[PDB]
């Protein structure tokens, strides 16, 4: 088929990049990063090791508090406030790239992260009350 490679679809449309997410997901913790000798290269490599797991788990932490654990494409119950981006679907997924999309959605990325957070807290509270009978 195609298989562009790691970040190979960085310039492709959002919909086309949304079909090769495993390509980036698997390289978020591996690479080349057995004794711990504290030389100038050893201290350098140890930090490179702790830094990878740290950043990897911070993304999985947010993915957990949203109810999206172990997911690449999860859907939510947070509606799209058009003040975030009034662009239409066809001019988003068949037009923009993820890089320029993140550039314009950047202001509201912290707002959306809160709506996904409490929506998961209330949804799990709803599921518990439904299983109380």
């Amino acid at each position, epitope marked *: 088929a195609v298989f562009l490679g790691f970040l190979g679809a960085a310039g492709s*449309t959002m919909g086309a990049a949304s079909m090769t997410l495993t390509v980036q997901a698997r390289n978020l913790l591996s690479g080349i990063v057995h004794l711990l000798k504290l030389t100038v290269w050893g201290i350098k490599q140890l930090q490179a090791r702790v830094l990878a797991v740290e950043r990897y788990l911070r993304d999985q932490q947010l993915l957990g508090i949203w109810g999206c654990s172990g997911k690449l494409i999860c859907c939510t119950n947070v509606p799209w406030n058009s003040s975030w981006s009034n662009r239409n679907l066809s001019e988003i997924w068949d*037009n923009m790239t993820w890089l320029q999309w993140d550039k314009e959605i950047s202001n509201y990325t912290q707002i959306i992260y809160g709506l996904l957070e409490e929506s998961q807290n209330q949804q799990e509270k709803n599921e518990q009350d439904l299983l109380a009978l």
Partner: nanobody, 128 residues
Framework: QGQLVQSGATTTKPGSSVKISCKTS????????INWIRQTAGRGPEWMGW????????????????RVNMTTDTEVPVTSFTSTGAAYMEIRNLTSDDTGTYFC????????????????WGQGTLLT
């Protein structure tokens, strides 16, 4: 955004072959097709053809099959998502019945069903 400034509106006489330019700004010139449209007075507006500033692939109507040369030169990176481009248009067995206003319009989307659709147009040029 996006701008498409066209060439001058000078005139010639039958038998010749004129070149029409179209300079783009405010968008990545490679990401969208470039269409050529003709609005004659003695006919309905006609789609002449589009070309890919990225892949070089061109597609023109059979009425212009062996009479038109469509060319574009490579863009110039201005920013990460902005570039300047240029598209060219020529006619072969030219007469005076091809008189009218000529436009250049870029594609609509980068993918889907309406990819090459003329969406953002130029100011046009008057001919012979």
């Amino acid at each position: 955004q996006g701008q498409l400034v066209q060439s001058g509106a000078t005139t010639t006489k039958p038998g010749s072959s004129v070149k029409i330019s179209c300079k783009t700004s405010g968008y990545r010139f490679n990401f969208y097709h470039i269409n050529w449209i003709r609005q004659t007075a003695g006919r309905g507006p006609e789609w002449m053809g589009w070309i890919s500033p990225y892949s070089g692939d061109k597609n023109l109507a059979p009425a212009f099959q062996d009479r038109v040369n469509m060319t574009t030169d490579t863009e110039v990176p201005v920013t990460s998502f902005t570039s300047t481009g240029a598209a060219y248009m020529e006619i072969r067995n030219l007469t005076s019945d091809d008189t009218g206003t000529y436009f250049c319009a870029k594609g609509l989307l980068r993918d889907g069903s309406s990819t090459w659709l003329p969406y953002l147009w130029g100011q046009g040029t008057l001919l012979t």
